[PDB]
Design an enzyme around this catalytic site. Sequence first.
Site, short mmCIF file in Angstrom:
data_model
loop_
_atom_site.label_atom_id
_atom_site.label_comp_id
_atom_site.label_asym_id
_atom_site.label_seq_id
_atom_site.Cartn_x
_atom_site.Cartn_y
_atom_site.Cartn_z
N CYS B 163 0.82 -1.19 0.00
CA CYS B 163 0.00 0.00 0.00
C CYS B 163 0.86 1.26 0.00
CB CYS B 163 -0.87 0.00 1.25
SG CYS B 163 -2.27 1.11 1.16
N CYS B 359 -6.70 4.31 -6.95
CA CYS B 359 -6.31 5.01 -5.73
C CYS B 359 -6.43 6.51 -5.91
CB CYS B 359 -4.88 4.67 -5.31
SG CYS B 359 -4.48 5.18 -3.60
C1 LIG Z 1 -3.95 4.33 4.91
C2 LIG Z 1 -4.73 3.66 3.82
C3 LIG Z 1 -5.17 4.37 2.71
C4 LIG Z 1 -5.92 3.73 1.71
N1 LIG Z 1 -6.36 4.44 0.60
C5 LIG Z 1 -7.08 3.80 -0.38
C6 LIG Z 1 -7.58 4.50 -1.48
O1 LIG Z 1 -7.40 5.71 -1.57
N2 LIG Z 1 -8.50 3.89 -2.32
C7 LIG Z 1 -8.73 2.53 -2.23
O2 LIG Z 1 -9.36 1.96 -3.12
N3 LIG Z 1 -8.06 1.81 -1.26
C8 LIG Z 1 -7.39 2.45 -0.24
N4 LIG Z 1 -6.73 1.70 0.69
C9 LIG Z 1 -6.72 0.21 0.54
C10 LIG Z 1 -8.00 -0.49 1.03
O3 LIG Z 1 -9.15 -0.02 0.36
C11 LIG Z 1 -8.23 -0.32 2.53
O4 LIG Z 1 -7.14 -0.86 3.25
C12 LIG Z 1 -9.56 -0.97 2.91
O5 LIG Z 1 -10.02 -0.51 4.16
C13 LIG Z 1 -9.46 -2.49 2.93
O6 LIG Z 1 -10.71 -3.01 3.31
P1 LIG Z 1 -10.89 -4.44 4.03
O7 LIG Z 1 -12.38 -4.68 4.14
O8 LIG Z 1 -10.21 -5.57 3.28
O9 LIG Z 1 -10.12 -4.24 5.42
P2 LIG Z 1 -10.47 -3.20 6.59
O10 LIG Z 1 -11.10 -1.95 6.07
O11 LIG Z 1 -9.19 -2.98 7.37
O12 LIG Z 1 -11.52 -3.99 7.54
C14 LIG Z 1 -11.11 -5.09 8.32
C15 LIG Z 1 -12.06 -5.11 9.51
O13 LIG Z 1 -12.00 -6.34 10.20
C16 LIG Z 1 -11.82 -6.10 11.58
N5 LIG Z 1 -11.12 -7.25 12.18
C17 LIG Z 1 -9.84 -7.66 11.94
N6 LIG Z 1 -9.59 -8.76 12.67
C18 LIG Z 1 -10.71 -9.07 13.36
C19 LIG Z 1 -11.00 -10.10 14.26
N7 LIG Z 1 -10.09 -11.06 14.50
N8 LIG Z 1 -12.25 -10.16 14.83
C20 LIG Z 1 -13.20 -9.21 14.51
N9 LIG Z 1 -12.92 -8.19 13.62
C21 LIG Z 1 -11.68 -8.13 13.06
C22 LIG Z 1 -11.08 -4.78 11.66
O14 LIG Z 1 -11.31 -4.14 12.90
C23 LIG Z 1 -11.72 -4.02 10.52
O15 LIG Z 1 -12.94 -3.44 10.91
C24 LIG Z 1 -6.09 2.34 1.74
C25 LIG Z 1 -5.49 1.61 2.77
C26 LIG Z 1 -4.86 2.27 3.83
C27 LIG Z 1 -4.24 1.47 4.94
C1 LIG Z 2 -2.93 8.10 -5.74
C2 LIG Z 2 -1.61 7.48 -5.48
C3 LIG Z 2 -0.43 8.17 -6.09
C4 LIG Z 2 0.54 8.84 -5.16
C5 LIG Z 2 -0.02 9.74 -4.05
C6 LIG Z 2 0.48 11.18 -3.98
C7 LIG Z 2 1.84 11.47 -4.60
C8 LIG Z 2 2.27 12.94 -4.69
C9 LIG Z 2 1.98 13.69 -5.95
C10 LIG Z 2 2.98 14.78 -6.33
C11 LIG Z 2 2.76 15.61 -7.59
C12 LIG Z 2 3.38 17.01 -7.53
O1 LIG Z 2 3.70 17.65 -8.73
C13 LIG Z 2 2.70 18.12 -9.55
O2 LIG Z 2 2.62 17.24 -10.62
C14 LIG Z 2 1.92 17.73 -11.85
C15 LIG Z 2 2.60 17.07 -12.97
O3 LIG Z 2 1.90 16.04 -13.59
C16 LIG Z 2 1.99 19.20 -12.15
O4 LIG Z 2 0.77 19.54 -12.87
C17 LIG Z 2 1.00 19.56 -14.23
O5 LIG Z 2 0.10 18.56 -14.90
C18 LIG Z 2 -1.25 18.87 -14.58
C19 LIG Z 2 -2.21 17.87 -15.13
O6 LIG Z 2 -2.27 16.64 -14.45
C20 LIG Z 2 -1.65 20.29 -14.95
O7 LIG Z 2 -2.91 20.58 -14.36
C21 LIG Z 2 -0.66 21.30 -14.47
O8 LIG Z 2 -0.98 22.59 -15.00
C22 LIG Z 2 0.73 20.92 -14.76
O9 LIG Z 2 1.64 21.84 -14.14
C23 LIG Z 2 2.18 20.05 -11.03
O10 LIG Z 2 2.77 21.27 -11.50
C24 LIG Z 2 3.07 19.50 -9.98
O11 LIG Z 2 2.98 20.34 -8.85
S LIG Z 3 -3.18 0.73 -0.75
#
Ligand SMILES: Cc1cc2nc3c(=O)[nH]c(=O)nc-3n(C[C@H](O)[C@H](O)[C@H](O)COP(=O)(O)OP(=O)(O)OC[C@H]3O[C@@H](n4cnc5c(N)ncnc54)[C@H](O)[C@@H]3O)c2cc1C
Ligand SMILES: CCCCCCCCCCCCO[C@@H]1O[C@H](CO)[C@@H](O[C@H]2O[C@H](CO)[C@@H](O)[C@H](O)[C@H]2O)[C@H](O)[C@H]1O
Ligand SMILES: [S]
EC number: 1.8.5.4
Lengths: 421, 421
Positions: B163, B359
């Site tokens: 992740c 993501c």
């Molecule tokens: C920081 C973070 C950011 C993320 N961002 C994104 C993103 O932007 N977009 C995306 O698509 N995915 C995201 N993810 C990935 C993923 O979607 C998440 O981790 C998501 O919550 C996974 O869902 P899950 O149901 O598998 O697990 P979880 O959401 O963790 O659920 C597991 C559940 O089971 C429970 N549990 C565990 N063990 C037991 C037990 N033994 N008995 C009873 N209950 C229990 C826990 O308490 C929890 O409630 C992110 C993950 C993390 C960690």
């Molecule tokens: C979701 C998971 C992925 C990783 C999570 C977060 C990572 C951090 C992201 C850092 C990006 C920072 O840098 C940023 O990038 C884009 C380049 O594509 C730039 O943006 C550039 O492309 C975009 C289009 O997408 C235009 O709108 C913009 O005018 C142009 O300057 C920004 O000027 C710069 O500030």
């Molecule tokens: S993730």
Amino acid sequence: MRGSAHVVILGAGTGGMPAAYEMKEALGSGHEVTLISANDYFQFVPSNPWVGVGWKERDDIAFPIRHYVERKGIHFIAQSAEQIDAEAQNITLADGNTVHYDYLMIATGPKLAFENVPGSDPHEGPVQSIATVDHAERAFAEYQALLREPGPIVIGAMAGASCFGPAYEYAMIVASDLKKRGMRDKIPSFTFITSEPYIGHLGIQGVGDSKGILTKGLKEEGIEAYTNCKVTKVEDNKMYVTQVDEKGETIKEMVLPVKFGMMIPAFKGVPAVAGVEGLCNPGGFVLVDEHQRSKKYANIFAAGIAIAIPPVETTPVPTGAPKTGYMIESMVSAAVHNIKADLEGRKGEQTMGTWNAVCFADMGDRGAAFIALPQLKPRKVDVFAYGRWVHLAKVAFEKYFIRKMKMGVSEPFYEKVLFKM
Amino acid sequence: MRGSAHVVILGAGTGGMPAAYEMKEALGSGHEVTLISANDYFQFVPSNPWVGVGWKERDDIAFPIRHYVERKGIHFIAQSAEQIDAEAQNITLADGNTVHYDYLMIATGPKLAFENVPGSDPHEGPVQSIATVDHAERAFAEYQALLREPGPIVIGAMAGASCFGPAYEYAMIVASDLKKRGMRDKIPSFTFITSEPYIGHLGIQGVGDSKGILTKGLKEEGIEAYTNCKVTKVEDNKMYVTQVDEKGETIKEMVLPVKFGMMIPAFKGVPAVAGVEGLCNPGGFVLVDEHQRSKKYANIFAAGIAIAIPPVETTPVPTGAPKTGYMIESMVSAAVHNIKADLEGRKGEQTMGTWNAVCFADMGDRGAAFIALPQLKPRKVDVFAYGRWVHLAKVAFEKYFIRKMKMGVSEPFYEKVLFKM
Ligand SMILES: Cc1cc2nc3c(=O)[nH]c(=O)nc-3n(C[C@H](O)[C@H](O)[C@H](O)COP(=O)(O)OP(=O)(O)OC[C@H]3O[C@@H](n4cnc5c(N)ncnc54)[C@H](O)[C@@H]3O)c2cc1C
Ligand SMILES: CCCCCCCCCCCCO[C@@H]1O[C@H](CO)[C@@H](O[C@H]2O[C@H](CO)[C@@H](O)[C@H](O)[C@H]2O)[C@H](O)[C@H]1O
Ligand SMILES: [S]
Ligand SMILES: Cc1cc2nc3c(=O)[nH]c(=O)nc-3n(C[C@H](O)[C@H](O)[C@H](O)COP(=O)(O)OP(=O)(O)OC[C@H]3O[C@@H](n4cnc5c(N)ncnc54)[C@H](O)[C@@H]3O)c2cc1C
Ligand SMILES: CCCCCCCCCCCCO[C@@H]1O[C@H](CO)[C@@H](O[C@H]2O[C@H](CO)[C@@H](O)[C@H](O)[C@H]2O)[C@H](O)[C@H]1O
Ligand SMILES: [S]
């Protein structure tokens, strides 16, 4: 006729061809469906740039329509409509025959408005076109003449254009091809001229980093780029260009000698459609509602480039927003649904849905593509992509779309999003 | 019981919460649905990084589950399962009570494997976590301690992590926040340590230009970045790092003092699930088929992070591919459909569909997001985006997902793609 409505589809292109199948599919054996088009063949438009540089042949992207629609119960008339009488609901063909309709669906696409720029017609000078396979073949011929006699190149898009992608595509692949032939260094100057207020505006105020990426692309290929341009005339093999500032004031004028050129023209409505009284805006684009129905004639519908869509922005040099394939299909689909509803009592409620633009360009081994929706910012989707996978996808779509045009469509067409399931 | 199958859902998180509603919806009044989870509240995981830096409060992203599922006919037990007997189909709870099931759906998500790195547990040293709201609150507390006593920062992802996005997010927003506080210049060094073979690998061999864009991003913020790293231990407030080459040979070792740190740990299966004989791979991930059914027990299904997914690549430092929200939902949906089928004679044929990763990361005023599918290249979709619109979209989704968790879902969940119609 009464109880057996006759439905005419005018124009057998990207919207018209599918519309014919869907219409027939929707209406079944009790109704007559007739497809009318200027040419007797279908052509896959997005492939024309490649033909323009000789990377594709006519035979790869075009085929004869008749057999494919007739085996589906559709009547095909390979004749251009010269005149539409909306009162009598009669269409006058080139050969003078007349065809009556109960419902008309207009899918005539764009008139290439070369007349806006004296000398710009491809039969009038060095500035060519890749809009149609006929034009792209001509473009390629002139490309070979340039190879035998290297001189200045000028590619780009005119004032009032709305289809910018293909100009960038063409410029890139031309550069590419020159390198492949080891000829790139014989070219005295390679200039890109566009009505966009900036590079990668694309008539949609930019999408993703189209600006940065297209700017760098042109720069990589040694192509000098000018924005906010309109061409005033093409004459003595020179392109007369006027460049304005944000407020439309002239900041310079240029005279560019052209040994080989391609400018995307402004699109207007075709004359037989524009000529219908009260049907179109001053551009010749059919004024329709959200259900694709003419605001003036209840039994006339329209889809594709032919319909009017309000601008959202007013650029220093006039430019239009593109009407692209997925949205055109939604338009077609809505119109077919609403005509069938009309034939059955109800008003059709189906609409085109959310405005969007999707485009794919193939540079050979890799492609660029974008998705933007809705029209105004901030968007819900605003994405630009590049890579070999975009090239693989263009290839796939052409192969698929062409097969579908031979096999027929029902059809909620874009279920090719099933690649998820 | 016979004729009235009792369905238990284990874990009330991203997959488990919706699974409970859908299960109940699918089965109706004739079947008992019971949700069992370690905590009595639901938390929106993707928001935890923001809590980690204090841009969000627990109250914004978490809420008590009981009322919301009970009003839908679902039984809620806020108790952790310590033991699962798959033969007797009995679950032993923390308080010693036992719960029988006819079907079990495991949605326990990940165990945060701090034990892989001695000293890395957030209660053991300066290296914190933003994986859970409890951890992110702790992370923020230590962030404030850093503000009072500026020292070295180290953010990143451990060997075996899957992740990566959130690590990049956290590093960026931490930098951002420091600037907002006018504190960025008090930080002696800001280092990013990752097991990825390169920046923006993201455990998916990169998507769009994630490499170039994440590299430049870290560079803009004055953050020094090291790849192909594994942390061997955290001790005396120092992080011991080992960096290998393509062939896993050590090219250097580092000792990094940490005043404030956050490393995404490797995920394993939770102990109560991993402890089931023959259920899981050595990682504790449930081995299931395409229908989400355990390969060992026909009445056990699994969805979310808990299930095993085969690697497609073997990186110099071990890394995993992420399991993300849209795919988890497809998993949940398939499992509910196939259990209901089981209860009605047929084998369910429904699958999770095509592998994908989606993501979204919000840096405050703008976001980055990606979509990749399927898992191996060349992909059908491989896209990276950035902009204010990605930020607006993250905001929208959290608001929507949380409401849905309070209101209940039926439901082919992701019809939020209707923004097209
Ligand atoms: C920081 C973070 C950011 C993320 N961002 C994104 C993103 O932007 N977009 C995306 O698509 N995915 C995201 N993810 C990935 C993923 O979607 C998440 O981790 C998501 O919550 C996974 O869902 P899950 O149901 O598998 O697990 P979880 O959401 O963790 O659920 C597991 C559940 O089971 C429970 N549990 C565990 N063990 C037991 C037990 N033994 N008995 C009873 N209950 C229990 C826990 O308490 C929890 O409630 C992110 C993950 C993390 C960690
Ligand atoms: C979701 C998971 C992925 C990783 C999570 C977060 C990572 C951090 C992201 C850092 C990006 C920072 O840098 C940023 O990038 C884009 C380049 O594509 C730039 O943006 C550039 O492309 C975009 C289009 O997408 C235009 O709108 C913009 O005018 C142009 O300057 C920004 O000027 C710069 O500030
Ligand atoms: S993730
Ligand atoms: C070079 C090029 C590249 C493009 N690339 C893309 C892209 O990559 N992706 C995408 O989504 N969009 C693309 N577009 C935009 C758009 O999809 C195409 O222009 C598309 O073909 C428009 O379809 P249409 O049905 O409105 O018009 P057309 O496809 O042009 O069809 C109009 C039809 O009506 C016929 N016709 C016109 N007048 C008459 C008459 N009076 N009587 C009888 N028949 C008549 C014409 O012969 C033609 O068959 C591209 C456009 C061009 C020009
Ligand atoms: C579809 C309509 C749009 C316009 C039509 C065609 C316009 C011409 C496109 C020119 C692009 C050329 O420039 C090209 O851009 C991308 C930058 O994003 C670079 O590619 C860069 O990002 C991509 C991801 O998208 C990575 O796979 C790649 O490793 C990285 O280098 C290429 O190194 C560069 O060669
Ligand atoms: S276009």
